[PDB]
Design a protein around this ligand. Structure first.
Ligand code: SF4
Ligand code: FCO
Ligand code: SF3
Ligand code: F3S
Ligand SMILES: [Cl-]
Ligand SMILES: [Cl-]
Ligand SMILES: [Li+]
Ligand SMILES: [Mg+2]
Ligand code: 3NI
Lengths: 265, 581
C-alpha cells in the first residue's frame, strides 16, 4: 500500500528536532521511514544534493500537490531580504511558501518552527519569525520543545497515519494529547514542592534527596509538555529528574523570561 | 577570469562553473561552487555558509550562569559540546574550580557525544557516498554473509538476515516511493564496492540507525535529556546519592548500572560494526588515499581535550593532545595559546560582516559580529544568487587563521598532531591501520584518511568512556560524591570585570568560546567553531581554507553529478549551524 508523502524542510535551526526524531524508541525511526510514511525530501538524510535535490523537491510537490504533509524545522528570517537563510541561491522563505502551497497540512516541529526559539531571543538579529506568521492559509500543528520528546514526535506521526486525521489541538495549535497539562502537574517532585522541601544550592543535602527545584528557577509551573510523564530517551530521564529545573523550553519566548535560575513569578 | 597562486595551488576561475546548493547530508545550510577545466579537473573551489542566527549578539546582556543553555543551541548535532565550552569559559573568567566527579562526568558527556556523533556521521551522513544502496539489490545473501563473517565477529550475519534486509529494500523500492534514495548517484563509476559489500553496508546503516538512540541514554542519566542536555557553572546538576535515604531522587547504583550497560554495548557496536566497515571502505577505495589532501599535509590544528586532572587544562592533563603544525613541518609541533592576540584571528574581508578595517584579523577578545549581507556582483541579484563572487564577500562564515596560517581541524588533524608528538597508542594504531591497507603513512592525509581517523576516534572514545566511568566509581568507593562547587555561584562573589576562554575538541575539531563579564552580565561572547575553520572563506592574502583546498585538483567523472565533491566535503563532517552560529 502506498505511504503518505512527507516533505521535510529546514530554515534557521540547529537540527535538534531531526536528531530527536531519530532517537524514537517505538516505532523506531527506521520503521517510520521504511513502513509508515514516504520521507520524500529531507536535506539531512537524502542521497541527492544540488540540482538533483532540487529536482526531487520540484517533482514531489508537483506530483503530490494537495496530498503531502509538510514538516518544517527551524524558521524564516525576515532580515536582509530573507538572505540570512539561503536555499538554492534564494531566500529560504520562498522555498517555505512554495512547499506550503501544495501541502495538505503542516507540522511545525520544535520551538523554532512554532515560536522562534533561540535565534528569536532578544535582540533577534535576523528577524526570525515562526511559520504561522508567514503561512496563514494552512492547518499548522505546533509541536514545541527544544527539541520535542522523541517518542512524542513518533506518537504524533503514528496517530496521524493510524487515525487518518490531525490531532485535536489547544488554542495555540499544540496537540492536546501531549501538551494539555503542565510539567508541574505531573512532576514526581511535587510532594516536596507542597511540603516546602527545596534545593537551595547545587549538591546540597536537599539535592541529594531529589527535593523540588523551584528555588533553583524551575519553570515547570508555567510549561506545558510531556516530560514529567512520558519522559526522555525511552523513559530514562527528564531535566528535573537529573537535577536541573525545567528551562521552559516548550513555551513561546522562554529565553526572554529572565534568568533560568530566577524563580517563577 | 583571473588566476593566482596560494599554498602550492593555482586558483583559476576560467572554465565551466558548477553549483551545488543545497549541500545535503550535512547539518545546516551550505553552498559550494567550483570551476573545472577541459579535463574535468577542479581549478577553483568556493565554500559558502548560507545561514546565520547571531548567538554572539543574543548572548550580550545574559547572566553568565545561563550562557551554556543559549550556546548549546548553536548545534543539535554536536549537542552538548558548546555547553561544555561555555561552562569552561565562565569558570575560567570567574575563577571557579569544579569537584573531580563533575569533571569526570563532563568527560563522559564529551566521550558519549564523540561516539554518537562519529557513528551517525559514518552511516547516515557519509555512508551513501561509498555504499551504492540500489546495487545491494543485486547481492547474493550467502556471499554477503561470507563477507561479513570474514571481516568481523559481529553476531548478525546470517544469510537469512541479509536476505530479509534485501527483501525489505526491494519492497520499499518496488512501489516507486524511493524516499531518501530518490534521484541519487547510484551506478556512478566511482562506486567500487561489490554487491555483497553494498548489502552488508546497507544492513549496517539500518543497525546504526537503530543503535545510535541507545548511546545518548548516558546523556539522559547525567544531563536529563538528549538532544540538549543540562549543565551548570560549578559542575553538574546530577547530584549523587548511593547509600542514603532519598537515593531514589539522585544518581544511584541503578542509574550507574544503566550507564555501564550502555558503555559496554556502545564499545561492542563501534568495534565490531563501524571499525570493520571503515577498513572495508578503505580496502575497496584505495585511490581515495590520494584525493582530497588539501591542508592536511601543510597546516593542522588541535586545542586538545579531556582534562584528566580536574581544573588543569595543561599538556600533562589533557588526554587528547593539542598543538599546531605549519608549513608541512610535522617535526615541529607548536604550542597553542588562546589568549595570545597574534595566534587565533578572524578575518571578514570575504564574509558578510563589517569591521572598521577589513584588511586585519581580530582575536576573539576583540571580536565583532556586525552582519552585513553584501554579495556584490553575482550573476543574478541580491535575492537570486546564480554565481557567488569569490573575489569579494561570499559567506556567512568568518575566516579564522592561526598566526596568519589557514589550518585544518578535526579527527585527521588531531591524529597527525598526536602521532607527531609521539603518543605511543596513536603511533601504534595508525601504523597498524595503514599496514592493514598496504598504504604509506601519507595515505592518511586524504579524504579516505579523514574517514579512517573518525572511525578510530569513535573506538578511542568508547574505550575512554569505560576509563572515566571506572574513575567515577573509584571516587564513590572512597566516599567522594561532590558534583558541584557553589562558593562563587552568587554574582556578588564575582570580579566586577573579568574574561575567560573555554576550549575543547568537538567531534569536528578545535572549539573555543571567549567570554568577557562585566557587572554580572555577558559583555562579549565570541565563538570560533571547528567548521568555521574548515569551511572558511578567503583572507586578505587570498589564502584558502581546508574545504576549498581539499576540493582543489579533484577529477570529476561526470560534472553534473557531484559525487567527488560530496565525498570530500562529507569527509570533514560539515556542521553549518556551528560554523556560523
Ligand atoms: S521540580 Fe519544578 S515541576 Fe517539579 S514540583 Fe518542583 S517546581 Fe514543580
Ligand atoms: N563537532 C562539532 Fe560542532 C562544529 N563544527 C562544534 O563545536
Ligand atoms: Fe530541532 S532546531 Fe534546535 S534550537 Fe530550539 S527548537 Fe530549534
Ligand atoms: S526544559 Fe524542556 S525538555 Fe521538558 S522539562 Fe522543561 S519542557
Ligand atoms: Cl530545506
Ligand atoms: Cl520562542
Ligand atoms: Li569573480
Ligand atoms: Mg564567531
Ligand atoms: Ni554542530
Amino acid at each position: 500500500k502506498p505511504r503518505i508523502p512527507v516533505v521535510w524542510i529546514h530554515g534557521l535551526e540547529c537540527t535538534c528536532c531531526t536528531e530527536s526524531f531519530i532517537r524514537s524508541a517505538h516505532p523506531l525511526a527506521k520503521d517510520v521511514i521504511l513502513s509508515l510514511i514516504s520521507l520524500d525530501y529531507d536535506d539531512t538524510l537524502m542521497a541527492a544534493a544540488g540540482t538533483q535535490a532540487e529536482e526531487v523537491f520540484e517533482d514531489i510537490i508537483t506530483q503530490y500537490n494537495g496530498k503531502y504533509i509538510l514538516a518544517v524545522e527551524g524558521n524564516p528570517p525576515l532580515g536582509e531580504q530573507g538572505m540570512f537563510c539561503i536555499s538554492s541561491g534564494r531566500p529560504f522563505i520562498e522555498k517555505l511558501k512554495r512547499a506550503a502551497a501544495g501541502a495538505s497540512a503542516i507540522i511545525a516541529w520544535g520551538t523554532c518552527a512554532s515560536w522562534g526559539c533561540v535565534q528569536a531571543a532578544r535582540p533577534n538579529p535576523t528577524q526570525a519569525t515562526p511559520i504561522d506568521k508567514v503561512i496563514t492559509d494552512k492547518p499548522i500543528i505546533k509541536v514545541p520543545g527544544c527539541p520535542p520528546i522523541p517518542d512524542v514526535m513518533s506518537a504524533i506521526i503514528t496517530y496521524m497515519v493510524t487515525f487518518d486525521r490531525l490531532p485535536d489541538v489547544d488554542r495555540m495549535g499544540r496537540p492536546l494529547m501531549f501538551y494539555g497539562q503542565r510539567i508541574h502537574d505531573k512532576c514526581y517532585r511535587r510532594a516536596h514542592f507542597d511540603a516546602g522541601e527545596f534545593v537551595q544550592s547545587w549538591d546540597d543535602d536537599a539535592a541529594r534527596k531529589g527535593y523540588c527545584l523551584y528555588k533553583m528557577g524551575c519553570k515547570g509551573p508555567t510549561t506545558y509538555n510531556a516530560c514529567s510523564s512520558t519522559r526522555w530517551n525511552d523513559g530514562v530521564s527528564f531535566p528535573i529528574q537529573s537535577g536541573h529545573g525545567c528551562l521552559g523550553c516548550a513555551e513561546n519566548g522562554f529565553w526572554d523570561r529572565g534568568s533560568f535560575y530566577s524563580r517563577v513569578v | 577570469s583571473t588566476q593566482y597562486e596560494t599554498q602550492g595551488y593555482t586558483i583559476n576561475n576560467a572554465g565551466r562553473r558548477l553549483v551545488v546548493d543545497p549541500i545535503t547530508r550535512i547539518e545546516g545550510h551550505m553552498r559550494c561552487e567550483v570551476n573545472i577545466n577541459d579535463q574535468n579537473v577542479i581549478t577553483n573551489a568556493v565554500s559558502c555558509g548560507t545561514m546565520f542566527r547571531g548567538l554572539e549578539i543574543i548572548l550580550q546582556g545574559r547572566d553568565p550562569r545561563d550562557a551554556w543553555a543559549f550556546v548549546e543551541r548553536i548545534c543539535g548535532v554536536c549537542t552538548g559540546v558548546h555547553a561544555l565550552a561555555s561552562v569552561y569559559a565562565i569558570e575560567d573568567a570567574i575563577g571557579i574550580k569544579v569537584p573531580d566527579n563533575a569533571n569526570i562526568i563532563r568527560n563522559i558527556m564529551l566521550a558519549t557525544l564523540w561516539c554518537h556523533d562519529h557513528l551517525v556521521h559514518f552511516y547516515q551522513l557519509a555512508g551513501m557516498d561509498w555504499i551504492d544502496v540500489l546495487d545491494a539489490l543485486k547481492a547474493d545473501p550467502r556471499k554477503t554473509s561470507e563477507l561479513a563473517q570474514s571481516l568481523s565477529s559481529w553476531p548478525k550475519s546470517s544469510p537469512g538476515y541479509f536476505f530479509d534486509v534485501q527483501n525489505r529494500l526491494k519492497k520499499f523500492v518496488e512501489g516507486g516511493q524511493l524516499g531518501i534514495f530518490r534521484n541519487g548517484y547510484w551506478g556512478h563509476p566511482q562506486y567500487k564496492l561489490p554487491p555483497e559489500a553494498n548489502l552488508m553496508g546497507f544492513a549496517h546503516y539500518l543497525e546504526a540507525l537503530d543503535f545510535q538512540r541507545e548511546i545518548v541514554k548516558i546523556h539522559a542519566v547525567f544531563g536529563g535529556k538528549n538532544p540538549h542536555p543540562n549543565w551548570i557553572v560549578g559542575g553538574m546538576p546530577c547530584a549523587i546519592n548511593i547509600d542514603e535515604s532519598g537515593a531514589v531522587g539522585a544518581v544511584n547504583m541503578e542509574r550507574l548500572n544503566l550507564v555501564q550497560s550502555i558503555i559496554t554495548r556502545t564499545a561492542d557496536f563501534i568495534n565490531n560494526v563501524m571499525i570493520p566497515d571503515a577498513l572495508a571502505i578503505g580496502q575497496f577505495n584505495k585511490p581515495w588515499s590520494e584525493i582530497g589532501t588539501g591542508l592536511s599535509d601543510k597546516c593542522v590544528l588541535s586545542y586538545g581535550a579531556f582534562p584528566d586532572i580536574a581544573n588543569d587544562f595543561g599538556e600533562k592533563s589533557l588526554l587528547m593532545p593539542g598543538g599546531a603544525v605549519i608549513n608541512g613541518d610535522f617535526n615541529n609541533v607548536l604550542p597553542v595559546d588562546l589568549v595570545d592576540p597574534q595566534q587565533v584571528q578572524e578575518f571578514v574581508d570575504h564574509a558578510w560582516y563589517r569591521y572598521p578595517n577589513d584588511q586585519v584579523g581580530r582575536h576573539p577578545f576583540d571580536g565583532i559580529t556586525d552582519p552585513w549581507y553584501n554579495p556584490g556582483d553575482v550573476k543574478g541579484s541580491d535575492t537570486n544568487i546564480q554565481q557567488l563572487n569569490e573575489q569579494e564577500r561570499y559567506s556567512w562564515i568568518k575566516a579564522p587563521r592561526w598566526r596568519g596560517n589557514a589550518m585544518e581541524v578535526g579527527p585527521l588533524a588531531r591524529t597527525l598532531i598526536a602521532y607527531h608528538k609521539g603518543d605511543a597508542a596513536t603511533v601504534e594504531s595508525v601504523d597498524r591501520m595503514m599496514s592493514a591497507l598496504n598504504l604509506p603513512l601519507s595515505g592518511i592525509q586524504s579524504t579516505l584518511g579523514r574517514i579512517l581517523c573518525r572511525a578510530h576516534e569513535a573506538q578511542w572514545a568508547a574505550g575512554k568512556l569505560q576509563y572515566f566511568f571506572d574513575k567515577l566509581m573509584t571516587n564513590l568507593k572512597n566516599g567522594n560524591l561532590a558534583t558541584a562547587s557553589t562558593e562563587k555561584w552568587e554574582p556578588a562573589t564575582w570580579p566586577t570585570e573579568c574574561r575567560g576562554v573555554g576550549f575543547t575538541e568537538a567531534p569536528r575539531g578545535a572549539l573555543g568560546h571567549w567570554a568577557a563579564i562585566r557587572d554580572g552580565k555577558i559583555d562579549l561572547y565570541q565563538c570560533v567553531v571547528p567548521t568555521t575553520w574548515n569551511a572558511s572563506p578567503r583572507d586578505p592574502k587570498g589564502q584558502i581554507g581546508a574545504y576549498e583546498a581539499a576540493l582543489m585538483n579533484t577529477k570529476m567523472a561526470i560534472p553534473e553529478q557531484p559525487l567527488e565533491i560530496l565525498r570530500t566535503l562529507h569527509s570533514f563532517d560539515p556542521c553549518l549551524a556551528c560554523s556560523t552560529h
